[PDB]
Amino acid sequence: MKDFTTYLSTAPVVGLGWAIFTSGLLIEINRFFPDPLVFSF
Amino acid sequence: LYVGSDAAALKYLDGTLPGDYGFDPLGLLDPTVSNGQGAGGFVNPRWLQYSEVIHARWAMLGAAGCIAPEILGKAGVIPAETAVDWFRTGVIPPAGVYKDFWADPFTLFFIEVVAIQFAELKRLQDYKNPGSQSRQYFLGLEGLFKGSDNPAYPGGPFFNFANFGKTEAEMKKLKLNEIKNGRLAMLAMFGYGAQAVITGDGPFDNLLAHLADPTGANLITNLGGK
Amino acid sequence: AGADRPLWSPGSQPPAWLDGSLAGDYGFDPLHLSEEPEMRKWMVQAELVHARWAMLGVAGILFTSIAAKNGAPFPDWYDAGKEAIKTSPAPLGSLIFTELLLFGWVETKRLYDLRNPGSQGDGSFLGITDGLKGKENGYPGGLFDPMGMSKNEASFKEAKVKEIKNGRLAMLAFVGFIAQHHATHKSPIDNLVDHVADPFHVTFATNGVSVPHFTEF
Amino acid sequence: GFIGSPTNLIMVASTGACLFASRFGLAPSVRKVAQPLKLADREVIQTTGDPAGFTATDVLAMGAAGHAIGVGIVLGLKGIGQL
Amino acid sequence: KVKIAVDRNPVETNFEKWAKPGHFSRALAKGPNTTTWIWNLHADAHDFDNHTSDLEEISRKVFSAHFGQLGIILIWLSGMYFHGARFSNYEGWLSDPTHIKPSAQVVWPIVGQEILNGDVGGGFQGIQITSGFFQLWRASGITSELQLYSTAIGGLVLAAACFFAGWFHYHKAAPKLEWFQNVESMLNHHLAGLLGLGSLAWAGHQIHVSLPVNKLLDAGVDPKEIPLPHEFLLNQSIIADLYPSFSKGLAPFFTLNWAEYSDFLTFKGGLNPVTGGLWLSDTAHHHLAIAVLFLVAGHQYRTNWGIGHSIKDILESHKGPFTGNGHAGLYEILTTSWHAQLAINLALFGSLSIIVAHHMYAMPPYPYLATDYGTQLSLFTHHMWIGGFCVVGAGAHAAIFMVRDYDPTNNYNNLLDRVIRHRDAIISHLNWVSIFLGFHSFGLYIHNDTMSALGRPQDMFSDTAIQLQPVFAQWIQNTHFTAPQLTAPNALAATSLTWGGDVVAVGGKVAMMPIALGTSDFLVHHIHAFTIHVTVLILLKGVLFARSSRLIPDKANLGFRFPCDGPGRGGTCQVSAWDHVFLGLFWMYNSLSIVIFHFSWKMQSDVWGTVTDSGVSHITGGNFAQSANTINGWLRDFLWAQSSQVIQSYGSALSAYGLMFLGAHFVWAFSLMFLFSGRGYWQELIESIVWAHNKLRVAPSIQPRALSITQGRAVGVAHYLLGGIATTWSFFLARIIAVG
Ligand code: CLA
Ligand code: CLA
Ligand code: CLA
Ligand SMILES: CC(/C=C/C=C(C)/C=C/[C@@]12O[C@]1(C)C[C@@H](O)CC2(C)C)=C\C=C\C=C(C)\C=C\C=C(C)\C=C\[C@@]12O[C@]1(C)C[C@@H](O)CC2(C)C
Ligand SMILES: CC1=C(/C=C/C(C)=C/C=C/C(C)=C/C=C/C=C(C)/C=C/C=C(C)/C=C/C2=C(C)CCCC2(C)C)C(C)(C)CCC1
Ligand SMILES: CC1=C(C/C=C(\C)CCC[C@H](C)CCC[C@H](C)CCCC(C)C)C(=O)c2ccccc2C1=O
Ligand code: SF4
Structure with missing residues (x-):
């Protein structure tokens, strides 16, 4: 497990996790707020 | 005797196995x-x-269960509607399903899955660890799963309750007879599958056709050739 | 409580981190989870909650379904929330955030008792010192154990084993509830009385789901 | 496929000629390989009661070759109007 | 002699080596200290010849890597079948294949990309696919989405089995070196079971499943009204009234009366007029004959039963008088060197992909395949580029074998030694013929451009001024048009419609029509020959001069992949065999780009189009006979006359193509400074950036370094090839979808 945990601790795995998290956050924001351009409320 | 023994294959095997006819071309x-x-x-x-x-x-x-219903239905032992072909019992719904069963075939399949998964997984765990199934409590009948040195022949109070094979000579004779009848059954099930595919009838019907008409009803005529 | 204990499969080799000390320790871990002691105690706490x-939830579902079969005007366990908020004086939105508000305190206390054992029973919460102190990892006791049958070690151990076994059975019950409600669209007690009415025919193979029918022949 | 049919007769004659060939020279058996001819060689596979080298792989290979030669000759004659 | 040799559990299945990234090599085993280490970790990852010197472990790694690639391919195929099962209009396409476009990709509406879900027809919205999977499934008898779902599930199961097989045959039961070295057994089993048995199984599927479903589909009945394939399999009545020879029931096969099977095993050449594809009975008899031929070929090599040929004996026996030791040491070379086998496999696989592209643009072996111009163009271009990449990698891995696995002790007077012994003459003659071909083709093009711009249309090398007609190609076309007349009397028609004859059209669109070859065709064919000749020159110069040269006599000690030998001897940059492959990659790109441009223009001008009562109206009006003789014609009448759909695709479903088009141009530009420049400039810029990060104490512990010269060349060629291929892909697909 700790060998597997250090494998997930490697740079490409945490990079993939960050990319998935950021892409999902931005996609859900754009879906639930369709076409945001002007900062108004 | 040796059934089709091949040389340069007995170099790596001595006579310990029941059959051991020396037939090992590929190796x-x-x-x-x-x-x-x-x-x-x-x-x-x-x-x-x-x-x-x-x-x-x-x-x-399988050979016994494919022979018995057709033979007993040709006689008056079992009723005729339960004497359907072995492929028409429900094993292949394209071939036929016996609708007059006490349960759905998938219900019997699930009951089979549970029961034979228990049996075969206990068998596998004893194959990897000999005698291990006699240690963990099952129902109180753990002593029935003592096993032996050979995984093929566990014995015990259930698998050998008749206690046949007390000495080495008749045990070797029984092992050789078992493997001979078993190999004959491999050939029998092979023939049953081939006959079922290319005739669409029971094996005893094929036997009766060959007995009544040897030249007119055989492998050549069943393929359409003459 | 170890060594020659009944495992999840006879003849299996128990893991090194599963020595049988924990309740329900049958040595079942193909994926080698709970190897680290901190992850082991996290897994124990998660399994317990x-x-x-x-x-x-299974007891509530069974009680409501049994009362509905007997004659009480109770809806099915599925889609109960719709009629619940229909008859609730509290509307949705406020209800879930209210539940989160009175849940965050208990979850914070549980998490910081799991990370720091005995730190909750320091008089910080309304001057409570003897109470709110975790006797074990996922077993707090104190105010949550008013009657003291857990003082005996043997009684505590057998109660832990019974609790974890009934809890695993409850996971299986909830999974079965979801599965055969998606398959039959009926109450679990309705499925039970259908199975005890015609056991040889009414089963998982006759609902039109689970086992698919394509040729019908 | 008919018994006594000319196609079956010629292909059976070809298969029998191929089988009787390697029994005495000509065709490359297990014990006769060489580059252009027949040269002495080992056995490896037991012949199972067969004199010289005429084991099961020999009869299998030569029966396959005989069946192939027979069907080729039969279809070539059928293409040009013969049997 | 031949037997299974397997070691039990040589490698433990643990995750301890997943934590340490660099573990296969001792250089990366010490951990990282600079950023190039990371690139090295992603460079020598699958260079198993450098990790260990033991051939057995290398062979085991190769076996497991092949299992992993097969699992990846099966996962991809299962995903294709799943996309056809759920996010597709295959059932709607089966009703009217000539009016609904094939679509199997549906996007999520997120930021306005839902406009990519175009109106393909049949009440569906999605991306118009050009892979031709719809035609393949129609050829396979697939009717409902349930069959596609089952195929996807089976493909996922087989991919899991392949991954388990790789894990098992590496970690649990690893085959020994003697198991891999049984080349005779490998060849026999591959020719008999991998190819012969597969061809027989596919022929049986075609005969028992694909032929009746395709016949009923061509009859015009509803796909739902068509009986399921198992109904054809079991009950013989439907296959009997669909094909009377099935009423005999396997009698004509064993009685040698194969002519009775002529109804469903046919030889009608050409295309089926109902669907514009190859006849399914012809494909069934084809795969049956292929299976029989490969079954015959699989019993050639002696393995364990005396009879059969020996590869070493065959190689050693073929020795001529002008070649010395004829094929002597090649058996030991190909049984010990993985890279020589890789070179041979890649060369033959790339050539096979080229034959595949040519022979399925020529004969469309799928129902309603020729009507979809976009599918045919995409398939041709894709197989073309895969073949070109594979034949480049052939020279690459041949050079790798020459650097690493070549032994002069086993090669004294053999064929390889004599090729090395006259490599200078080989390269000089190849250079001369490359120069001559480039002159007498491109100078002809420049001559045409000049005399067109000089107002001399009578001085051109065109179809009207100076006829350099392809007399040999025209004669071969006329001979193959008359192949069924005299030399193949049992063929009902010609083997293809490209030689001549009538015009086959489906749905008002031209499926296949005769192709005329003129002066422009001769010019582009000789241009292609010149480009292939130059690429061969580059790759052969890389292979033969990989070990030594008069310029550098110890190039073998420098390895296969080194940047240079310094600025000595005037400069020795890009002297390695790897750099030769890197240079030849661009030449392969240019060659295949010209080839696919010729293909697209030729089918758009002289093959594809619509059929009216007056005649055949092509897409571009047949300008190839008059505009393809000049570079300005390719600029204007092919690159500017087309590509208007790509730039005007905005606001439609094709717009992403145009977007990709622009992005492709970007990538094609972004490669150039990796191709230009060097390393010292970027290293000094990185030093300045290191100073900037050190001022703020944000300098990384891993020292950032510029990319290596070999690494920079690889990045440049990869981005250049990606940009060019994506540019051609976007332009081709947008042009062929908007007007096709
Ligand atoms: C007739 C028997 C037979 C068959 C069918 C195959 C088939 C294959 N071999 Mg194998 N091979 C055989 C015998 C056979 N081998 C023998 C006897 C040897 C030892 C001399 C080898 C040694 C060998 C090597 C060294 C390599 C292969 C590889 C391959 C694959 C080539 C890739 C391809 O065409 O994709 C076709 C793909 C498919 C059709 C997908 C389905 C593949 C299934 C799962 C395999 C079924 C065939 C298998 C042999 C059955 C026995 C396995 C059984 C024990 C479970 C292919 C799966 C390459 C490889 O590793 O690929 C993974 C490779 O590098 N073969
Ligand atoms: C791999 C390819 C392939 C396959 C699978 C088939 C299969 C079939 N074809 Mg086809 N055929 C093929 C190629 C193929 N053919 C080719 C190349 C031609 C030449 C053009 C033909 C020409 C042809 C004609 C003209 C006809 C067929 C017919 C048939 C069927 C008859 C089966 C039969 O007699 O075979 C022999 C099959 C066996 C002997 C069965 C195999 C033995 C079994 C599996 C043993 C099982 C034993 C098992 C272990 C025990 C039971 C297990 C259980 C307990 C679980 C069958 C569906 C006929 C049809 O549709 O009528 C029904 C028909 O009229 N075919
Ligand atoms: C389209 C761009 C382009 C062009 C035209 C050339 C041209 C050339 N390169 Mg190059 N190449 C290029 C880009 C290009 N390169 C790039 C980007 C790379 C990097 C991968 C390479 C990689 C490369 C390699 C690796 C090789 C070449 C070779 C060649 C020669 C081709 C052989 C031939 O017949 O040339 C004939 C000459 C031309 C086609 C140039 C145009 C000639 C016109 C028609 C003018 C005709 C004569 C004119 C009338 C006289 C002018 C008179 C005036 C002085 C007054 C030639 C010198 C090969 C070589 O050295 O020779 C075989 C070789 O091995 N090149
Ligand atoms: C099944 C389950 C967990 C299963 C876990 C498994 C198999 C793990 C297996 C393994 O880890 C092992 C052992 C070892 C590893 O090496 C390998 C794996 C494979 C990883 C949990 C269920 C857990 C189930 C839970 C917690 C159920 C809660 C139910 C509640 C709260 C009900 C609330 C209701 O709201 C409803 C739904 C509807 C309303 O009508 C009524 C009310 C009452 C309102
Ligand atoms: C004298 C003697 C005897 C006898 C013997 C005999 C008589 C034998 C025979 C034998 C034989 C007689 C054999 C055979 C075999 C065969 C085979 C083995 C076959 C095969 C086949 C095949 C493989 C086929 C194929 C094909 C197909 C199907 C398709 C295509 C074409 C072809 C044809 C190729 C005895 C014993 C009594 C005793 C002693 C002495
Ligand atoms: C530009 C250039 C460099 C400098 C470039 C270097 C060192 C490589 C830089 C790679 C970067 C770090 C890749 C990752 C870029 C982004 C940070 C990743 C994407 C981020 C978004 C997803 C947010 C060379 O080192 C070089 C060497 C030899 C020949 C030509 C050149 C060359 O042209
Ligand atoms: S350092 Fe660069 S410029 Fe200098 S010889 Fe090497 S590759 Fe050429």
């Missing part, structure tokens, strides 16, 4: 094949003997 |  009983430690590959003499005897027992059960 | 909520 799979060589200890050089899959040599090392651990589980390894599935081509090893221990697993080969175990799978051969298990295939033999299953094919013997 | 999932078990407790599983038996609570």
Whole structure:
């Protein structure tokens, strides 16, 4: 497990996790707020 | 005698196995094949003997269960509507399903899955660890699962309750007879499958057709040729 | 409580981190989870809270379905929330955030008791010192154990084993509830009386789901 | 496929000639390989009661070759109007 | 002699080596200290010849890597079948294949990309696919989405089995070196079971499943009204009234009366007029004959039963008088060197992909395949580029074998030694013929451009001024048009419609029509020959001069992949065989770009189009006979006359193509400074950036370094090839979808 945990601790795995998290956050924001351009409320 | 023995194949095998007719053209009983430690590959003499005897027992059960309903339906023993062909019982719904059963075929399939998964997984755990199933409490009948040195022949108060084979000579005779009838059953089940595919009828019907018309009803005429 | 104990499969080799000390330790871990002691105690706490909520929810579902079969005007366990908020004085939105508000305190206390054992029973919460102190990892005791049958070690151990076994059975019950409600669209007690009415025919193979029918022949 | 049919007769004659060939020279058996001819060689596979080298792989290979030669000759004659 | 040799559990299945990234090599085993280490970790990852010197472990790694690639391919195929099962209009396409476009990709509406879900027809919205999977499934008898779902599930199961097989045959039961070295057994089993048995199984599927479903589909009945394939399999009545020879029931096969099977095993050449594809019975008899031929070929090599040929004996026996030791040491080379086998496999596989592209643009072996111009163009271009990449990698891995696995002790007077012994003459003659071909083709093009711009249309090398007609190609076309007349009397028609004859059209669109070859065709064919000749020159110069040269006599000690030998001897940059492959990659790109441009223009001008009562109206009006003789014609009448759909695709479903088009141009530009520049400039810029990060104490512990010269060349060629291929892909697909 700790060998597997250090494998997930490697740079490409945490990079993939960050990319998935950021892409999902931005996609859900754009879906639930369709076409945001002007900062108004 | 030796049934089609091939030379340069008895170099790696002596006479210990029941049949051991020396027939090994391709070569799979060589200890050089899959040599090392651990589980390894599935081509090893221990697993080969175990799978051969298990295939033999299953094919013997299948040959008996494919012969008995048709023969007993030709007589007055079992009723005729329960004497359907072995492929029409529900094993292949394109071939036929016996609708007059006490349960749905998938319900029987699930009951079979639970029961035979229990049986075969206990068998596998005893194959990997000999005598291990006699230690963990099952129902109080753990002593029935003592096993033996050979995984193929566990024995005990249930598998050998008749206690046949007290000495070595008749035990070797029984093992040789079991493997001979089992190999005959492999051939029998092979023929049953081929006859079912290319005739669409029961094996006893094919036997009666060959007996009544030897030249007019055989493999050549069943393929359309003359 | 170890060594020659019944495992999840006879003849299996138990893991090194599963020595049988924990309740329900059958040596079942193909994926080698709970190897680290901190992850082991996290897994024990997670299993305990999932078990407790599983038996609570399954008991509520069974009680409501039994009363509905007997004649009480109770809806099915599925889509009960719709009629619940229809008859609730409290609307949705406020209800879930209210539940989160009175849940965050207990969850924070549980998490910081799991990370720091005995730190909750320091008089910080309304001057409570003897109470709110975890006797074990996922077994707080104190105010949560008013009657003291857990003082005996043997009684505590057998109660832990019974609790974890009934909790795992409750996970299986909840999974079965979801599966055969998606398959039959009926109450679990309705499925039970259908199975005890015609056991040889009414089963998982006759609902039109689970086992698919394509040729019908 | 008919018994006594000319196609079956010619292909059976070809298969029998191929089988009787390697029994005495001509065709490359296990014990006769060489580059252009027949040269002495080992056995490896037991002949199972067969004199010289005429084991099961020999009869299998030569029966396959005989069946192939027979069907080729039969279809070539059928293409040009013969049997 | 031949037997299974397997070691039990040589490698433990643990995750301890997943934590340490660099573990296969001792250089990366010490951990990282600079950023190039990371690139090295992603460079020598699958260079198993450098990790260990033991051939057995290398062979085991190769076996497991092949199992992993097969699992990846099966996962991809299962995903294709799943996309056809759920996010597709295959059932709607089966009703009217000539009016609904094939679509199997549906996007999520997120940021306005839902406009990519175009109106393909049949009440569906999605991306118009050009892979031709719809035609393949129609050829396979697939009717409902349930069959596609089952195929996807089976493909996922087989991919899991392949991954388990890789894990098992590496970690649990690893085959020994003697198991891999049984080349005779490998060849026999591959020719008999991998190819012969597969061809027989596919022929049986075609005969028992694909032929009746395709016949009923061509009859015009509803796909739902068509009986399921198992109904054809079991009950013989439907296959009997669909094909009377099935009423005999396997009698004509064993009684040698194979002519009775002539109804469903046919030899009608050409295309089926109902669907514009190859006849399914012809494909069934084809795969049956292929299976029989490969079954015959699989019993050639002696393995364990005396009879059969020996590869070493065959190689050693073929020795001529002008070649010394004829094929002597090649058996030991190909049984010990993985890279020589890789070179041979890649060369033959790339050539096979080229034959595949040519022979399925020529004969469309799928129902309603020729009507979809976009599918045919995409398939041709894709197989073309895969073949070109594979034949480049052939020279690459041949050079790798020459650097690493070549032994002069086993090669004294053999064929390889004599090729090395006259490599200078080989390269000089190849250079001369490359120069001559480039002159007498491209100078002809420049001559045409000049005399067109000089107002001399009578001085051109065109179809009207100076006829350099392809007399050999025209004669071969006329001979193959008359192949069924005299030399193949049992063929009902010609083997293809490209030689001549009538015009086959489906749905008002031209499926296949005769192709005329003129002066422009001769010019582009000789241009292609010149480009292939130059690429061969580059790759052969890389292979033969990989070990030594008069310029550098110890190039073998420098390895296969080194940047240079310094600025000595005037400069020795890009002297390695790897750099030769890197240079030849661009030449392969240019060659295949010109080839696919010729293909697209030729089918758009002289093959594809619509059929009216007056005649055949092509897409571009047949300008190839008058505009393809000049570079300005390719600029204007092919690159500017087309590509208007790509730039005007905005606001439609094709717009992403145009977007990709622009992005492709970007990538094609972004490669150039990796191709230009060097390393010292970027290293000094990185030093300045290191100073900037050190001022703020944010300098990384891993020292950032510029990319290596070999690494920079690889990045440049990869981005250049990606940009060019994506540019051609976007332009081709947008042009062929908007007007096709
Ligand atoms: C007739 C028997 C037979 C068959 C069918 C195959 C088939 C294959 N071999 Mg194998 N091979 C054989 C015998 C056979 N082999 C023998 C006897 C040897 C030892 C001399 C080898 C040694 C060998 C090597 C060294 C390599 C192969 C590889 C391959 C694959 C080539 C890739 C391809 O065409 O994709 C076709 C793909 C498919 C059709 C997908 C389905 C593949 C299934 C799962 C395989 C079924 C065939 C298998 C042999 C059955 C026995 C396995 C059994 C024990 C479970 C292919 C799966 C390459 C490889 O590793 O690929 C993974 C490779 O590098 N072969
Ligand atoms: C791999 C390819 C392939 C396959 C699978 C088939 C299969 C079939 N074809 Mg086809 N055929 C093929 C190629 C193929 N053919 C080719 C190349 C041609 C030449 C053009 C033909 C020409 C042809 C004609 C003209 C006809 C067929 C017919 C048939 C069927 C008859 C089966 C039969 O007699 O075979 C022999 C099959 C067996 C002997 C069965 C195999 C033995 C079994 C599996 C043993 C099982 C034993 C087992 C272990 C025990 C039971 C297990 C259980 C307990 C679980 C069958 C569906 C006929 C049809 O549709 O009528 C029904 C028909 O009229 N075919
Ligand atoms: C389209 C761009 C382009 C062009 C035209 C050339 C041209 C050339 N390169 Mg190059 N190449 C290029 C880009 C290009 N390169 C790039 C980017 C790379 C990097 C991968 C390479 C990689 C490369 C390699 C690796 C090789 C070449 C070779 C060649 C020669 C081709 C052989 C031939 O017949 O040339 C004939 C000459 C031309 C086609 C140039 C145009 C000639 C016109 C028609 C003018 C005709 C004569 C004119 C009338 C006289 C002018 C008179 C005036 C002085 C007054 C030639 C010198 C090969 C070589 O050295 O020779 C075989 C070789 O091995 N090149
Ligand atoms: C099944 C389950 C967990 C299963 C876990 C498994 C198999 C793990 C297996 C393994 O880890 C092992 C052992 C070892 C590893 O090496 C390998 C894996 C494979 C990883 C949890 C269920 C857990 C189930 C829970 C917690 C159920 C809670 C139910 C509640 C709260 C009900 C609330 C209700 O709201 C409803 C739903 C509807 C309303 O009508 C009524 C009310 C009452 C309102
Ligand atoms: C004298 C003697 C005897 C006898 C013997 C005999 C008589 C034998 C025979 C034998 C034989 C007689 C054999 C055979 C075999 C065969 C085979 C083995 C076959 C095969 C086949 C095949 C493989 C086929 C194929 C094909 C197909 C199907 C398709 C295509 C074409 C072809 C044809 C190729 C005895 C014993 C009594 C005693 C002693 C002495
Ligand atoms: C530009 C250039 C460099 C400098 C470039 C270097 C060192 C490589 C830089 C790679 C970067 C770090 C890749 C990752 C870029 C982004 C940070 C990743 C994407 C981020 C978004 C997803 C947010 C060379 O080192 C070089 C060497 C030899 C020949 C030509 C050149 C060359 O042209
Ligand atoms: S350092 Fe660069 S410029 Fe200098 S010889 Fe090497 S590759 Fe050429």
